[PDB]
Every structure is written in structure tokens, then in C-alpha cells.
Amino acid sequence: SGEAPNQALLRILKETEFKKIKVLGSGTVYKGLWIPEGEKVKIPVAIKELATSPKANKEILDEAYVMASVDNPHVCRLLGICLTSTVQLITQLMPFGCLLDYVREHKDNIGSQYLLNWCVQIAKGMNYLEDRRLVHRDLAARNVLVKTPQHVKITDFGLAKLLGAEEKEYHAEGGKVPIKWMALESILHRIYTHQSDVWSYGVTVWELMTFGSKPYDGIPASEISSILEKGERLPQPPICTIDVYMIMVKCWMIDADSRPKFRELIIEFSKMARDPQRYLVIQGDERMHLPDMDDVVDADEYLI
């Protein structure tokens, strides 16, 4: 067989097993409890539905197809779907919300250990997504969720595409795409590879280091294609040593094969996470609380 059978289980859940408790966003996302029938368990969940359009349920279901196929500590789990009036997605609740809003809100308690670790964790999820031959196509700080301050997960696969065991790209079409996080080949030829995920990783790391800044704040999207062609990129963030900023910049090579692989980002940021203060200069760094062997890396961070 050309490709491997996807034997993920799609679980369908009874309407009465939830206890939807509150809106988190407005489709519309909710907080709730899931009590599996019989089992002595209560599981905190987010429930995401959408009125019903025949075109809307087709897209949320692709999202479920993907979320149901991924299984990694740094990627979000689908717990199931509920097939009522309108289709609901069910995931593990990530109590602290998306990471973008979180760095903004907690700016003054976020120290370099957390920043660099988040970076390691996002790279691990993304490297896993790559192993499963899946191109996220929408990586950004808004699409990273926080389980605890110690633990983030990649989310929002409403654009993920699977590549064959021999297809080395994706050719997309019409539809809204966030262009500021987009590799260049993706703005010119609508090309998307694992390596164009790496670009957006670049921009995502830049969001964290600048504690939640909008990229090219001001610059309208129609020009972005041109600015990037004239050799211009995002500025070095204040807290950033050239060592860190240099990795960001490498993620933005125009030649996508010269950009780093997610498994290299994991190794680079690991080493830096071992002396956080030598790499990020954060004022008041040492005393912060949220709720030679330069080259040593742990095997758990060495994934080839």
C-alpha cells in the first residue's frame, strides 16, 4: 500500500455526557464537563461548534479528522465529536487559554526559562506533526494553548494538510490566510511545506520574545509580499541575544531548505534552556513566578 492506513478512532459522544458551563469565545467555543457513562470520571473539556450550513460542517469535520489522528504531548487531543443539531468538537480544556493572550497578560512574570521552554515544546509538537507528514499551515502564538504555564500544545488544525509519502508540498487555493506568519513561497506560489511551517515558527517565537507584538504592526498585508522580497525581516526583540535572534532569522531564509528543521530547533533551544540567562536578557529575570558542557543535550530532545 502506498500510504499507511489511518486507524485513528473517531469517538462519538452523547449530548447528555457533557455539562456545558460557559462561553470562552464567540463558531463558538465553550467550557464544560464530560462525564463518560458509567465511569467514575469527570473530564474538563472545551466544546467547539458553530446555525447549520452544509458547507460549515464539512470543514469542522476535516478538523476533527486531523485532531483525531494526532497523539503527542505537545499537540491538542480530540476527545470526540457530538452529532447533535450542529456538530460539536470536544477537546481537553486548556485552562490558561491561548499563549498570545497569555504573554500579553502576564508579561511581567514571564522569565527566560518559560520562554525558551515554550519554544522547545512548540518545536516538539511541530516535529511530531512533521513525522505524521502533516503541514499545519497556521502556526502562530494564538494557536498555541496553555495547559499549565509549564505545558503548551499546538492547536487549530483547520488548515492542516497531509502530504503523501512522496508528495513534497501542498498547493492551496482561495480562502483567508494570515499572511504575516506566512513563508514567502506561500505568498507567491501558495506553496506550503514543513519548511514553510518553520518560517511561521520563526514569527511565533518572535511574538513570544516581544511579549505579544503584532508583526509588521501597521504594515498592511498587500505590501508584506514586497517588504520580504527586499530582504527585510522582523526586528531583533529587546530581550533577545543575537544567538536567539539568529535562529529566528535562519527560519526566514528565502531558500526554504536552508531553514532549520524542527528537530534542530528542539536541540538548539534545549541547549539554551539550560542556561536561560545567557540567551535572554529579561529585567528582573531571576525573581519571577507564574502559576565545559555547552553542547550537552538530553536524549529525550535528540529525535532523528
Q: What is the resolution of this structure in A?
A: 2.8
Last residue of a domain, one of 36, 67, 93: 93
Give yes or no: residues 68 and 115 share one domain. Answer: no
- For residue 58, the domain's CATH number is 3.30.200.20
Task: Pick the closest to residue 280 from 200, 206, 202, 203 (CA basis).
Answer: 206
8 A C-beta contact, residue 234 and residue 248: yes
End-to-end CA gap in the chain: 25
Give yes or no: residues 80 and 213 share one domain. Answer: no
SS3 state of residue 105 = helix
Give yes or no: residues 103 and 158 share one domain. Answer: yes
Give yes or no: residues 157 and 265 share one domain. Answer: yes
Task: Pick the closest to residue 270 from 290, 242, 293, 251 (CA basis).
Answer: 293
Let me know if residue 125 belongs to a domain.
yes
Let me know if residue 79 belongs to a domain.
yes
Tell me the binding residues: 24-29, 48, 91-92, 156
Residue 89's CB: how many other CB atoms inside 10 A? Answer: 23
Residue 217's CB: how many other CB atoms inside 10 A? Answer: 8
φ/ψ of 190, rounded to 5, equals 40, 50
Give yes or no: residues 147 and 287 share one domain. Answer: yes
Rg (CA), the chain: 20
| Cα of 166 vs its chain's centroid, Å | 25
Give the number of domains in the chain.
2
Give yes or no: residues 74 and 105 share one domain. Answer: no
Let me know if residue 47 belongs to a domain.
yes
Let me know if residue 169 belongs to a domain.
yes
Domain of residue 210: give its range. Answer: 94-294
Let me know if residue 300 belongs to a domain.
no
Tell me the binding residues for ATP: 24-29, 48, 91-92, 156
- For residue 134, the domain's CATH number is 1.10.510.10
Catalytic residues: 138
Give yes or no: residues 101 and 85 share one domain. Answer: no
Technique that determined the structure: X-ray
Adjacent-strand bridge partners of 43: 34
Report which residue type is found at 81: I
Largest CA distance in the chain: 63
